[PDB]
């Protein structure tokens, strides 16, 4: 359970489809990245805290096409999807701001 890793680009849409109509929060990450590391535990706790939404993790180098088509310019970057459509975005390791926007979507 928890934060689900997307191992390569073709596995990404399946994940977006498999979220059904649930909110999907995708954390775009990469290796040797301090803020990425700082936020990781919190993100994992958020998924524990919100089992009604789906939490995913994409490494921008394992999933280049996904990073590029989502116009990812820095990490960590969180994208928000509902029914496979990107509806929001949040950059950074400020966990408070992140959970506040997740809550605003769980509306």
UniProtKB/Swiss-Prot annotation:
Disulfide bonds join 33-36. It is found in: Cytoplasm; Nucleus. Keywords: Cytoplasm, Disulfide bond, Electron transport, Nucleus, Phosphoprotein, Proteasome, Redox-active center, Transport. Ubiquitous. Its main location: cytoplasm. GO terms for molecular function: disulfide oxidoreductase activity; protein-disulfide reductase activity. One of its GO terms (cellular component) is proteasome complex. Residues 1-107 form the Thioredoxin domain. Component of the 19S regulatory cap of the 26S proteasome. Interacts with PSMD14/RPN11. Interacts with, and reduces EEF1A1. Active thioredoxin with a redox potential of about -250 mV. This is Thioredoxin-like protein 1. It comes from Homo sapiens (Human). The gene is TXNL1.
């Amino acid at each position: 359970v928890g934060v689900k890793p997307v191992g390569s680009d073709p596995d990404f849409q399946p994940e977006l489809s498999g979220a059904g109509s649930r909110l999907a929060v995708v954390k775009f990450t990469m290796r040797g990245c301090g803020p990425c590391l700082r936020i990781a535990p919190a993100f994992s706790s958020m998924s524990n805290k919100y089992p009604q939404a789906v939490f995913l993790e994409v490494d921008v180098h394992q999933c280049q096409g996904t990073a590029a088509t989502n116009n990812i310019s820095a990490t960590p970057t969180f994208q928000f999807f509902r029914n496979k459509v990107r509806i929001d975005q949040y950059q950074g390791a400020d966990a408070v701001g992140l959970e506040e926007k997740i809550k605003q979507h769980l509306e």
